[PDB]
mmCIF file of C-alpha atoms in Angstrom:
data_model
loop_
_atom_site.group_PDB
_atom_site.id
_atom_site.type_symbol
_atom_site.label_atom_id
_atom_site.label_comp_id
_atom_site.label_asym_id
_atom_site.label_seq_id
_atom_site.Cartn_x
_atom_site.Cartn_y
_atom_site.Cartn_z
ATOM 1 C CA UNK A 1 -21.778 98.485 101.194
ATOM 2 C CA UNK A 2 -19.738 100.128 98.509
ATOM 3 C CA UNK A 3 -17.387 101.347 100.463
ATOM 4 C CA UNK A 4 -16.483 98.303 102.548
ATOM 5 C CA UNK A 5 -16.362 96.126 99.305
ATOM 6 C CA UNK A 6 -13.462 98.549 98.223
ATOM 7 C CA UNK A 7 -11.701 98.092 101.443
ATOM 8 C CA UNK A 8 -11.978 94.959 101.296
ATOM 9 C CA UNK A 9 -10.396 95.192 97.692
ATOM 10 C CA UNK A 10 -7.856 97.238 98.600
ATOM 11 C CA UNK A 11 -7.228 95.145 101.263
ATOM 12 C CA UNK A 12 -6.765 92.160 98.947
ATOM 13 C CA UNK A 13 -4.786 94.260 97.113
ATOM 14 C CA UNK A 14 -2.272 94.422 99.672
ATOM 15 C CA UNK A 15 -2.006 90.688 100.823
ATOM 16 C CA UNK A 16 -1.359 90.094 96.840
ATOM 17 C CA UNK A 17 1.357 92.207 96.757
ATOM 18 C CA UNK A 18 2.558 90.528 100.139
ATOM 19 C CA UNK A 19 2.503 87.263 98.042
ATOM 20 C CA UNK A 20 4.288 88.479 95.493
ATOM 21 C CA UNK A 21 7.064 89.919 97.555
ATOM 22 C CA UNK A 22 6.983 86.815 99.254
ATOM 23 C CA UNK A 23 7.775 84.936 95.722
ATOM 24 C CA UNK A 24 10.390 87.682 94.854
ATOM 25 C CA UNK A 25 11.937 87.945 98.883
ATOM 26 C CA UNK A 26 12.115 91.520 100.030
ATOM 27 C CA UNK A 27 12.292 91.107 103.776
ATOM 28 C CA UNK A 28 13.076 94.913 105.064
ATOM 29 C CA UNK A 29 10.202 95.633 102.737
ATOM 30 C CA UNK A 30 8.095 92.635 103.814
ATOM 31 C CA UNK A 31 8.700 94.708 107.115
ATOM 32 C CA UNK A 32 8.326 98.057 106.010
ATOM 33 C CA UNK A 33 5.414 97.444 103.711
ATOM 34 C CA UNK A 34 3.298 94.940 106.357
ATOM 35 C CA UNK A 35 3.627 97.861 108.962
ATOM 36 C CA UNK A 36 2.576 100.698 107.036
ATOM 37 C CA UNK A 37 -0.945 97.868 106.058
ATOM 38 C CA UNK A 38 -1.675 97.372 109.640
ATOM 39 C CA UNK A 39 -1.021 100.838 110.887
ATOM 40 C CA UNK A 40 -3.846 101.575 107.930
ATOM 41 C CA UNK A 41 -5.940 98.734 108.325
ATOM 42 C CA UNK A 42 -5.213 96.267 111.374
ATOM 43 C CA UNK A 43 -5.530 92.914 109.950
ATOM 44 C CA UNK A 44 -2.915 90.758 111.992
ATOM 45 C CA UNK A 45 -1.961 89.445 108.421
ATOM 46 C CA UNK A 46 0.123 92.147 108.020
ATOM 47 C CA UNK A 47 2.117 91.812 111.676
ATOM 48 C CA UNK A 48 2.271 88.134 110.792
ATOM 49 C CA UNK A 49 3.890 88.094 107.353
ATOM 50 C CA UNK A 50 6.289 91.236 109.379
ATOM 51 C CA UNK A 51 7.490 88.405 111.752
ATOM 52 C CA UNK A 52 8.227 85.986 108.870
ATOM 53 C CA UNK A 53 9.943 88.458 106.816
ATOM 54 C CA UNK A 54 12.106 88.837 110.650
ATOM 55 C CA UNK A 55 12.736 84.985 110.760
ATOM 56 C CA UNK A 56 13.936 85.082 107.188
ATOM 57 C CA UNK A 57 16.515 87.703 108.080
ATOM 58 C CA UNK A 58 17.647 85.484 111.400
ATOM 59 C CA UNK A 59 15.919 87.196 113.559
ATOM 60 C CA UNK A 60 13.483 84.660 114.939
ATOM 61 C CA UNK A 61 13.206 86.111 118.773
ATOM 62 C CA UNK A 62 12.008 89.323 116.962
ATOM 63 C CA UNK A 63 9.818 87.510 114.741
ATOM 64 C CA UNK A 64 8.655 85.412 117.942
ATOM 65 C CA UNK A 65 7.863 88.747 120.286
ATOM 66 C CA UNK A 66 6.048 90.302 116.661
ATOM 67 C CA UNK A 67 3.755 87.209 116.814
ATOM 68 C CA UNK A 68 2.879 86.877 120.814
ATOM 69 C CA UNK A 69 0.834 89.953 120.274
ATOM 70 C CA UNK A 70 -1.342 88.376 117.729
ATOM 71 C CA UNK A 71 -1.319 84.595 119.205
ATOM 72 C CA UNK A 72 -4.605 85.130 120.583
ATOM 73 C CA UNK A 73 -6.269 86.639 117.467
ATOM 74 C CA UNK A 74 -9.308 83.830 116.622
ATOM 75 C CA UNK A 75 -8.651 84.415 112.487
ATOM 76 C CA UNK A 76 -5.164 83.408 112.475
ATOM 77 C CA UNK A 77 -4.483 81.276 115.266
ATOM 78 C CA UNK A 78 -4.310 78.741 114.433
ATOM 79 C CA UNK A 79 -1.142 79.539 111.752
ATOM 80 C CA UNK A 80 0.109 81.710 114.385
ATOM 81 C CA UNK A 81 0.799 78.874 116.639
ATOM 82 C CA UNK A 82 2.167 76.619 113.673
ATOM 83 C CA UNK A 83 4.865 79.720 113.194
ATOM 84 C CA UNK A 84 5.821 80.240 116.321
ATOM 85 C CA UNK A 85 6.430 76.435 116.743
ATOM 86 C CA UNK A 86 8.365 76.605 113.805
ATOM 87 C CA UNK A 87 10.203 79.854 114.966
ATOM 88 C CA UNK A 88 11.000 78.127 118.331
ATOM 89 C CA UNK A 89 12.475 75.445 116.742
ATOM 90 C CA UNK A 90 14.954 77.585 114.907
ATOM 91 C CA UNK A 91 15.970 79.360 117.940
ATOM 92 C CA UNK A 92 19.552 79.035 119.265
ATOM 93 C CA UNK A 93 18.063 77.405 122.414
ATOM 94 C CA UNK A 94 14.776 75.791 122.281
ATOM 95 C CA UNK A 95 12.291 75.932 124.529
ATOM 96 C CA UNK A 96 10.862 72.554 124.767
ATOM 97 C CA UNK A 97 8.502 73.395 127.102
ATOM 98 C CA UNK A 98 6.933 76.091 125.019
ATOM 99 C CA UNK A 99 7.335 74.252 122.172
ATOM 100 C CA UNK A 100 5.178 71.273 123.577
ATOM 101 C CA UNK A 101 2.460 73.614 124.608
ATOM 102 C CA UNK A 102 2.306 75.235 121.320
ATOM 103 C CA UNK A 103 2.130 71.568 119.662
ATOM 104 C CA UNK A 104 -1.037 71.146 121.696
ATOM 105 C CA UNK A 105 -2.648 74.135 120.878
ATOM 106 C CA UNK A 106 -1.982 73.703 117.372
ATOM 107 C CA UNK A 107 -3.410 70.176 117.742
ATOM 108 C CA UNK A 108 -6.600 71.565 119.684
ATOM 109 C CA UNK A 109 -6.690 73.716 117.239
ATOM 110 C CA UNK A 110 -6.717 72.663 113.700
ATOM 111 C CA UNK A 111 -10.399 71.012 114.630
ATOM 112 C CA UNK A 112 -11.776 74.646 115.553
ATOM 113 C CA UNK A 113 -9.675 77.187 113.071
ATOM 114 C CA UNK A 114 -11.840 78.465 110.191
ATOM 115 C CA UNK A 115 -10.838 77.927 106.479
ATOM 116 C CA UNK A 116 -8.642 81.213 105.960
ATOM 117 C CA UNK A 117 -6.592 80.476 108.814
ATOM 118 C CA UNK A 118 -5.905 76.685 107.460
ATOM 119 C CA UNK A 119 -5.293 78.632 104.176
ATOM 120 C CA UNK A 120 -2.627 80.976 105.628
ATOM 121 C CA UNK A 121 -0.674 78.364 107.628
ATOM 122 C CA UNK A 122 -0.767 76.009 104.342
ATOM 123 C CA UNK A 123 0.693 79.132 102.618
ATOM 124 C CA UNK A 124 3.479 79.489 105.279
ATOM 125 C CA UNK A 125 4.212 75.489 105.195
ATOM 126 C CA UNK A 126 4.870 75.859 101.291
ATOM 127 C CA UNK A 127 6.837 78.856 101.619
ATOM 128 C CA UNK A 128 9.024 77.051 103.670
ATOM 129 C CA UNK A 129 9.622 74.702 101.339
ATOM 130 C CA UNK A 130 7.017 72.188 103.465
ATOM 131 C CA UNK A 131 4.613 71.043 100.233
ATOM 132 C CA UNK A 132 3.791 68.304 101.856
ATOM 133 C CA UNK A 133 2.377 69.937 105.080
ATOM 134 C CA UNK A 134 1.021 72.804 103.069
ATOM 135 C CA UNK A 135 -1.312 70.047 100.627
ATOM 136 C CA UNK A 136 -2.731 68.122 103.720
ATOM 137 C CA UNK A 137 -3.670 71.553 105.121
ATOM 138 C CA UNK A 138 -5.353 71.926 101.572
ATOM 139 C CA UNK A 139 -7.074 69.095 101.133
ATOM 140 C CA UNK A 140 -8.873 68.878 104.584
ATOM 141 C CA UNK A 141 -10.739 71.614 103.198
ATOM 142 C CA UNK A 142 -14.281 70.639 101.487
ATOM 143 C CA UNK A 143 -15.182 74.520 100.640
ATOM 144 C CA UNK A 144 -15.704 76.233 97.509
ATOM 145 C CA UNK A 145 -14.363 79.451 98.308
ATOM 146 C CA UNK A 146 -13.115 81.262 95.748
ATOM 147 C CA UNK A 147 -9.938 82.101 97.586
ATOM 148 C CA UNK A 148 -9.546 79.202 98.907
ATOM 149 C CA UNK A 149 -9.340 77.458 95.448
ATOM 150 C CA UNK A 150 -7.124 79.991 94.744
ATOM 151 C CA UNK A 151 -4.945 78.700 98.123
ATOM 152 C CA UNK A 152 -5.433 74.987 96.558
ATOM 153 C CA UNK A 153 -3.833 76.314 93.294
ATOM 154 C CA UNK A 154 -1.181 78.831 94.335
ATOM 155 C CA UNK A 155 0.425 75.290 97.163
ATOM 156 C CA UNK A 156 0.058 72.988 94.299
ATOM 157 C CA UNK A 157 2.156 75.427 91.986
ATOM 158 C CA UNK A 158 4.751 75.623 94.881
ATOM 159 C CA UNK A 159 4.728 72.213 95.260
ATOM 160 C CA UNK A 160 5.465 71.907 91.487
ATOM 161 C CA UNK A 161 6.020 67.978 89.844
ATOM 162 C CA UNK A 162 3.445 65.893 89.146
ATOM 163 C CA UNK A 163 1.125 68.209 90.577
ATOM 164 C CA UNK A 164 1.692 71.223 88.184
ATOM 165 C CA UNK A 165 -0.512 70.720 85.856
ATOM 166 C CA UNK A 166 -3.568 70.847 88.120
ATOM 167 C CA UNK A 167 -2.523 73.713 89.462
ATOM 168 C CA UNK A 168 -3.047 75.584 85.748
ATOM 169 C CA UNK A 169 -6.173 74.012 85.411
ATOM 170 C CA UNK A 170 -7.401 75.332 88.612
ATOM 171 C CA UNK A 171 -5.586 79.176 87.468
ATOM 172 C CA UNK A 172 -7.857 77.882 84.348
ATOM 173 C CA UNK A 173 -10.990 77.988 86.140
ATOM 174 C CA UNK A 174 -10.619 80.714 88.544
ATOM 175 C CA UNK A 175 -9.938 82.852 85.221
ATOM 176 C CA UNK A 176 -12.909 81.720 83.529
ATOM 177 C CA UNK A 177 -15.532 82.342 86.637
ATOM 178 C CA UNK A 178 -14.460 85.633 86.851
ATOM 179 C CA UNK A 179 -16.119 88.561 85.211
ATOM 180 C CA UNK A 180 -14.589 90.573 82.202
ATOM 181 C CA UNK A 181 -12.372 93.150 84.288
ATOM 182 C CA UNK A 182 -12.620 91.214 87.386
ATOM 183 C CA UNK A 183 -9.595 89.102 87.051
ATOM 184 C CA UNK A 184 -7.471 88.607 89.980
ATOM 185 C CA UNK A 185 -3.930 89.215 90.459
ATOM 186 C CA UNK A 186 -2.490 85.665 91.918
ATOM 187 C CA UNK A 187 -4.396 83.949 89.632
ATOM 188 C CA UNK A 188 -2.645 85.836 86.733
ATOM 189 C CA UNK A 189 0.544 85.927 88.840
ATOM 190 C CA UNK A 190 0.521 82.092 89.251
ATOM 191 C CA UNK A 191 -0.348 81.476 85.383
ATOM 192 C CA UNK A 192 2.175 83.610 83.983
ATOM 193 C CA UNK A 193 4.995 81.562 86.520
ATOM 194 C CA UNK A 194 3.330 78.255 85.073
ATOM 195 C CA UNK A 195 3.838 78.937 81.703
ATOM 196 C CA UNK A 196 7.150 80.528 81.917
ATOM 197 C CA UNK A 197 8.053 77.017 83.970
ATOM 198 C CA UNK A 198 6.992 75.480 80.801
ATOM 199 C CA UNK A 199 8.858 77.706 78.287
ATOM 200 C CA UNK A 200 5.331 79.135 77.145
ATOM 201 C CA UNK A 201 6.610 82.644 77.016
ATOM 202 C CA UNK A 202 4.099 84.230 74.603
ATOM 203 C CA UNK A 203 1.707 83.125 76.824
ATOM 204 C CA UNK A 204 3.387 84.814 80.283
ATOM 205 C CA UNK A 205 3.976 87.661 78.172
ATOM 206 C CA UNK A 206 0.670 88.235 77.237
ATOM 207 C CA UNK A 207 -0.811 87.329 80.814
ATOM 208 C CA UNK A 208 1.943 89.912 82.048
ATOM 209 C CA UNK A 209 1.056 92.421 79.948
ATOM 210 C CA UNK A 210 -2.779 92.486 80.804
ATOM 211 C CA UNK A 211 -1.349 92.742 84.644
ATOM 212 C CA UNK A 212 0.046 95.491 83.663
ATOM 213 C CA UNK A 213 -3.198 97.095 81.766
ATOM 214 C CA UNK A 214 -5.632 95.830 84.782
ATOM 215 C CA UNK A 215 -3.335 96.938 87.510
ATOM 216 C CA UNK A 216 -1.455 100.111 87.020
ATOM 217 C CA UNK A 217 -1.163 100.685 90.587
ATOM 218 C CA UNK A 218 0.395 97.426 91.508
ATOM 219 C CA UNK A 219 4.434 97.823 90.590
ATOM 220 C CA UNK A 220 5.163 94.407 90.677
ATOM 221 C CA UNK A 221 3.751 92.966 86.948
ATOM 222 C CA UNK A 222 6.362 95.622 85.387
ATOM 223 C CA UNK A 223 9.387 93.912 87.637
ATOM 224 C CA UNK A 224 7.682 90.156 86.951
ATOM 225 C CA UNK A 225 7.968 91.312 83.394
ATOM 226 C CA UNK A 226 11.586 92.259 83.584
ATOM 227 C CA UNK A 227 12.609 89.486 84.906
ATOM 228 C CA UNK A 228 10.519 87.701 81.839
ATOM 229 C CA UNK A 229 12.489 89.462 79.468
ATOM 230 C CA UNK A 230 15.568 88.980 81.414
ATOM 231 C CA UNK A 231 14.569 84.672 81.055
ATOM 232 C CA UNK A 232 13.817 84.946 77.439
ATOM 233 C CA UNK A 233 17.536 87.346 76.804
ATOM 234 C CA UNK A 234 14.947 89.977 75.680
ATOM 235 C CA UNK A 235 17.417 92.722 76.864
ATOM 236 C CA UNK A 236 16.044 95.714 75.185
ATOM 237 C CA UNK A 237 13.181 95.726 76.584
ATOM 238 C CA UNK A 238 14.228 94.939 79.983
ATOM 239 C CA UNK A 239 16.220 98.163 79.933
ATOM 240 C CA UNK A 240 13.657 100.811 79.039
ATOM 241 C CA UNK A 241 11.000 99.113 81.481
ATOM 242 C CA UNK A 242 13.593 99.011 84.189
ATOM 243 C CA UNK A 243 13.749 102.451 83.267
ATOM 244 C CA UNK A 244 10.072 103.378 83.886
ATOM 245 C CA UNK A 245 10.424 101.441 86.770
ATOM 246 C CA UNK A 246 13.503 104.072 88.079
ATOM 247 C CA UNK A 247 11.484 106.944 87.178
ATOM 248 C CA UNK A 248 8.639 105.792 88.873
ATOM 249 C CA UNK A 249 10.918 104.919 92.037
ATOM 250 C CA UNK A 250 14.037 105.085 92.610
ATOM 251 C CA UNK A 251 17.063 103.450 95.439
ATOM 252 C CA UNK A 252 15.554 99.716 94.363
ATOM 253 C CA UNK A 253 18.475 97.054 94.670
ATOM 254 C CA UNK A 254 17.243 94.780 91.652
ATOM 255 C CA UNK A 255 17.410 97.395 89.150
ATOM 256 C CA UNK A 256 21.020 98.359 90.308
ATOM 257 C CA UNK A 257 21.876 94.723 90.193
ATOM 258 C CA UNK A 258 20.472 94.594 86.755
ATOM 259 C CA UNK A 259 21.997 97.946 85.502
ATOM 260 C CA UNK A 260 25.337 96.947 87.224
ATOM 261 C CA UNK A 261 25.165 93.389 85.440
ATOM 262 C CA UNK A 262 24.295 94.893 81.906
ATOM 263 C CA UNK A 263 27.390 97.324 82.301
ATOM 264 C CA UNK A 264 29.295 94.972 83.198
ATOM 265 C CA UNK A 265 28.164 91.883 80.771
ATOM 266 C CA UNK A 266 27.876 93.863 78.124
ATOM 267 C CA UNK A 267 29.463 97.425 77.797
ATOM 268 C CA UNK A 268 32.404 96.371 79.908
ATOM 269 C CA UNK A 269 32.646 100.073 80.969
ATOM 270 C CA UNK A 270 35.106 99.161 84.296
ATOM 271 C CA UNK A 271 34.512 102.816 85.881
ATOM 272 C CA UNK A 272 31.196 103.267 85.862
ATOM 273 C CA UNK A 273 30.235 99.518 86.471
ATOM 274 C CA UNK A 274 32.205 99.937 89.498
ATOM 275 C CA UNK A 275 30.044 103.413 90.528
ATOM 276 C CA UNK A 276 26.726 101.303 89.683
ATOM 277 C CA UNK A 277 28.074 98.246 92.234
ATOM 278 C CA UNK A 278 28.768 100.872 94.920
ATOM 279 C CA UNK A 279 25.397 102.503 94.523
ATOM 280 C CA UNK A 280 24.121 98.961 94.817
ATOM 281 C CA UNK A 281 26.634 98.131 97.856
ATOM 282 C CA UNK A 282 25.000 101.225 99.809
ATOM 283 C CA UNK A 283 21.677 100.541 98.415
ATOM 284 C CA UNK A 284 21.863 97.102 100.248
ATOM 285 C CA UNK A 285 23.596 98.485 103.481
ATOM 286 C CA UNK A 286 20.745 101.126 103.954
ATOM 287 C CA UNK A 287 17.765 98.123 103.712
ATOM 288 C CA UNK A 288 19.326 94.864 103.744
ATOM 289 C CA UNK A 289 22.256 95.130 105.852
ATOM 290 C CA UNK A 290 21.423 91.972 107.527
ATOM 291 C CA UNK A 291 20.680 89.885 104.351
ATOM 292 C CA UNK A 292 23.688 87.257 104.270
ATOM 293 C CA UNK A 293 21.838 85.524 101.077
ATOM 294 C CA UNK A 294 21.331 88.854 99.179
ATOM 295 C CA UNK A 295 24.794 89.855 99.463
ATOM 296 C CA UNK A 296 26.310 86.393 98.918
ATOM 297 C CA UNK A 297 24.763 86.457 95.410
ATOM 298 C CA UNK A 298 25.583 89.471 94.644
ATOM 299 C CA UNK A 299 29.110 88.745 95.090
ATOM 300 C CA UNK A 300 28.937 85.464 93.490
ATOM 301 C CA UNK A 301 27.189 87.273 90.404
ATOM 302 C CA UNK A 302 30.003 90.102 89.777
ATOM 303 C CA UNK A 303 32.912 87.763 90.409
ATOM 304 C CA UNK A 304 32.193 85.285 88.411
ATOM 305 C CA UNK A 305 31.908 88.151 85.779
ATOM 306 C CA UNK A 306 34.676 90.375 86.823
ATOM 307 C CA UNK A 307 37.297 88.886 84.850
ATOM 308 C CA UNK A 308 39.524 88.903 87.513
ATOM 309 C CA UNK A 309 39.467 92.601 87.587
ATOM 310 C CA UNK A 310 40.821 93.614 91.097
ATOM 311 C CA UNK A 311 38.104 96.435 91.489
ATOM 312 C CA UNK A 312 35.129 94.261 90.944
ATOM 313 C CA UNK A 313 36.959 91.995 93.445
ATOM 314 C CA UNK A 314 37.397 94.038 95.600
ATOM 315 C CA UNK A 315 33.925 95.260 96.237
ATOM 316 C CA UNK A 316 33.047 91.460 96.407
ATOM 317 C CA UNK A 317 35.621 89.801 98.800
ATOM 318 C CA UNK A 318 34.236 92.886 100.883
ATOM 319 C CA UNK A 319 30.779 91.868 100.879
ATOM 320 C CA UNK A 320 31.974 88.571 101.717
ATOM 321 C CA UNK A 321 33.879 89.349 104.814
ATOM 322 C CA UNK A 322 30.873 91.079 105.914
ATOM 323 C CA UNK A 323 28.850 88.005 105.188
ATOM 324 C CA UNK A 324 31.533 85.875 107.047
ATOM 325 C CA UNK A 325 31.444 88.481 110.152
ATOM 326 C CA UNK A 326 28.328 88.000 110.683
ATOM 327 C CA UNK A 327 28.257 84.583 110.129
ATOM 328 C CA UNK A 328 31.920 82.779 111.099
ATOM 329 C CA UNK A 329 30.217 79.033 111.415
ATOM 330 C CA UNK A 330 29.294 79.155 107.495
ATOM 331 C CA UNK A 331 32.007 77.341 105.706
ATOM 332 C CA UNK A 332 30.583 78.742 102.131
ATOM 333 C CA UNK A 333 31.602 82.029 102.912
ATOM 334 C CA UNK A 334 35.364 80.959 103.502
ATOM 335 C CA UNK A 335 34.922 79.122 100.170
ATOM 336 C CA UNK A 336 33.749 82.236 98.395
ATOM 337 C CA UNK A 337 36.050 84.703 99.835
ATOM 338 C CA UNK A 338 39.491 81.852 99.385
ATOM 339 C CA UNK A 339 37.742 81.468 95.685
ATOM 340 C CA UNK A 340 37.693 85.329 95.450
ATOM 341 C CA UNK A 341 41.812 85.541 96.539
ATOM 342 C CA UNK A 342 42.118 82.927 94.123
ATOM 343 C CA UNK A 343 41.046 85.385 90.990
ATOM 344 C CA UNK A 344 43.459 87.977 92.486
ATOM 345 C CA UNK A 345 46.246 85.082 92.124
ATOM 346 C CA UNK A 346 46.501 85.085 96.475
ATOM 347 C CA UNK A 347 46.807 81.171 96.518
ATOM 348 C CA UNK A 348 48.431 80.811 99.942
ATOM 349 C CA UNK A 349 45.571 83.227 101.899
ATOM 350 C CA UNK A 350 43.150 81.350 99.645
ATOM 351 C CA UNK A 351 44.517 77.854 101.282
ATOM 352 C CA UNK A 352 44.059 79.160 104.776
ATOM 353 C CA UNK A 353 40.358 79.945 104.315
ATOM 354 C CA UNK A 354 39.827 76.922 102.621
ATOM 355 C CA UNK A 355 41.510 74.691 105.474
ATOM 356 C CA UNK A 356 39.441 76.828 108.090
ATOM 357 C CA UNK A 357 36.509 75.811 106.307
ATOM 358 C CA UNK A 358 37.384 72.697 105.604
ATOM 359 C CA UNK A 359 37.915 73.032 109.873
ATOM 360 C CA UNK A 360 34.326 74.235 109.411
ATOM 361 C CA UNK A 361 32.925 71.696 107.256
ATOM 362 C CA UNK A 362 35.036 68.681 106.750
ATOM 363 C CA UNK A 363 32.106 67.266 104.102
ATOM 364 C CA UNK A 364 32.232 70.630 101.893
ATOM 365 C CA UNK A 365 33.676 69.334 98.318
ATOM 366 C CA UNK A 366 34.397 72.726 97.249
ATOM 367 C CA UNK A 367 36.803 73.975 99.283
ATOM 368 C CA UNK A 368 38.567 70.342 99.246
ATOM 369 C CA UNK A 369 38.579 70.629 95.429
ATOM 370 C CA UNK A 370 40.004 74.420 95.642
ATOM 371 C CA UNK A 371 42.329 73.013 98.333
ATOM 372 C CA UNK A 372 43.790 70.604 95.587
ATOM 373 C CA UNK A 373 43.361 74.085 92.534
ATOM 374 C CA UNK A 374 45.505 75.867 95.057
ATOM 375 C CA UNK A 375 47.788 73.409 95.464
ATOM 376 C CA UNK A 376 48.390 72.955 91.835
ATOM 377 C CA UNK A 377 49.208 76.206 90.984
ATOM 378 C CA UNK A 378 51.432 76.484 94.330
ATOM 379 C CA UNK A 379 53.480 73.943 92.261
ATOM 380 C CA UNK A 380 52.874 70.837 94.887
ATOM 381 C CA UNK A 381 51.538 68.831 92.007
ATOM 382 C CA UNK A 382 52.221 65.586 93.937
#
């Protein structure tokens, strides 16, 4: 019995740190990490959350072929229909068809799916930003489970508003039905985001910091608390823990994007800021090198703090032509990039992006705005 209670632990260990790359967005890890779980384990959870980590990098046919060998799994069928439904809709061309079948299977099956699978598909309809889905899921369930409560409470924190503060007091009472050391981590990990929501630091510190005492092992309280420190300018400490972090693994793209950032915010060291963003540019291209959202912001973040130097600029109009290669139909990638010749004083190159995007998009303000800031400094003031 021991033994499979630890399994099962470890187990749950691994679908919490699943959620909590899910709430922090790692999808060649999600990969990675969910593959390396069910090669040691099996569960389908691990496939599953694979194939969403696959539609969140555009990939849905991949994410679509990862889940047909799991459709027919009883535990998580039921969410495994609602995703591929969702998956085919995404698709370039739709299969209706297929699409209609899967809308009756989910139908027949909502009535026969047990409560973890109802759990699991609300957790994918309030990942994808679907509260509302996500809460009826929830609430057709009458059990008491302790993880399901815990379900009940982490979709009510997504959904956020008005609904917020239940959500602590069910972190509340999960935390108080638990033994001494027998706290569990999304409990703590939804607390802690609650009260930093609410400007309670101290309180996210301290529920951050017991993470940290309770669960060595798990790597993500020390990031969580980095990014704590980095909400509450509490530099300092961000740097040596971001340290630890680095000498307890290296080659991890947030704490180059943080190192870069501080050299660049703060020492203004040019040279080796530049080194750092390179690092972090081949970082990226090694496990991220089709993540058009990572590598839009982290162009956005070191050229709106470049101070026009060409270097910095250079590094980022680069990741945005990659961005715009592999996406030409996104008109806020010629918006970036014209914005980005702007800084290096190229206002006539900057005016042809912005009227091919404006080709693009006719609706998008900002490139019509830029289109005017180009103008003026062109000297057609009229």
């Amino acid at each position: 019995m021991q033994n499979q209670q630890q399994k099962m632990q470890t187990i749950l260990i691994a679908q919490s740190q699943v959620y909590y790359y899910i709430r922090e967005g790692f999808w060649s890890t999600m990969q990675r990490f969910c593959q390396e779980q069910y090669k040691a384990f099996g569960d389908p959870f691990f496939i599953f959350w694979k194939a969403y980590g696959l539609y969140q990098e555009g990939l849905p046919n991949e994410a679509i072929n990862e889940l047909t060998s799991i459709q027919h799994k009883k535990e998580i069928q039921y969410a495994t229909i609602v995703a591929l439904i969702t998956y085919h809709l995404s698709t370039n061309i739709v299969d209706r068809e297929t699409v209609q079948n899967l809308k009756f299977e989910e139908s027949t099956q909502r009535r026969l799916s047990s409560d973890k699978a109802i759990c699991l598909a609300a957790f994918f309809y309030a990942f994808n930003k679907e509260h509302a889905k996500a809460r009826d899921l929830i609430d057709e369930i009458h059990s008491d489970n302790f993880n399901i409560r815990i379900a009940s409470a982490w979709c009510y924190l997504l959904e956020g508003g008005k609904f917020l503060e239940k959500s602590v007091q069910l972190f509340e009472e999960l935390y108080n039905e638990q033994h001494e050391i027998n706290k569990n981590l999304e409990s703590l990990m939804g607390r802690s985001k609650a009260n930093e929501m609410i400007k309670k630091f101290d309180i996210s510190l301290n529920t951050i910091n017991e993470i940290n005492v309770l669960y060595p092992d798990f790597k993500g309280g020390l990031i969580e608390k980095a990014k704590l420190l980095m909400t509450v300018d509490d530099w300092e400490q961000l740097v040596d823990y971001c340290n630890k972090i680095l000498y307890d693994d290296d080659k991890n793209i947030m704490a180059l994007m943080l190192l870069t950032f501080y050299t660049f915010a703060r020492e203004g060291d040019i040279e080796t800021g530049c080194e750092r963003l390179q690092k972090l540019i081949q970082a990226v291209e090694f496990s991220e090198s089709r993540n058009m959202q990572l590598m839009f912001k982290i162009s956005q973040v070191f050229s709106r703090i470049s101070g026009r130097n060409t270097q910095i600029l250079k590094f980022t109009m680069k990741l945005v032509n990659q961005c715009k290669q592999l996406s030409p139909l996104n008109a806020q990638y010629f918006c970036e990039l014209a914005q980005q010749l702007l800084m290096v004083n190229q206002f006539e190159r900057a005016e042809q992006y912005f009227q091919e995007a404006s080709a693009i998009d006719v609706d998008n303000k900002e490139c019509l705005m830029g289109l005017i800031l180009s103008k003026i400094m062109q000297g057609q003031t009229e």
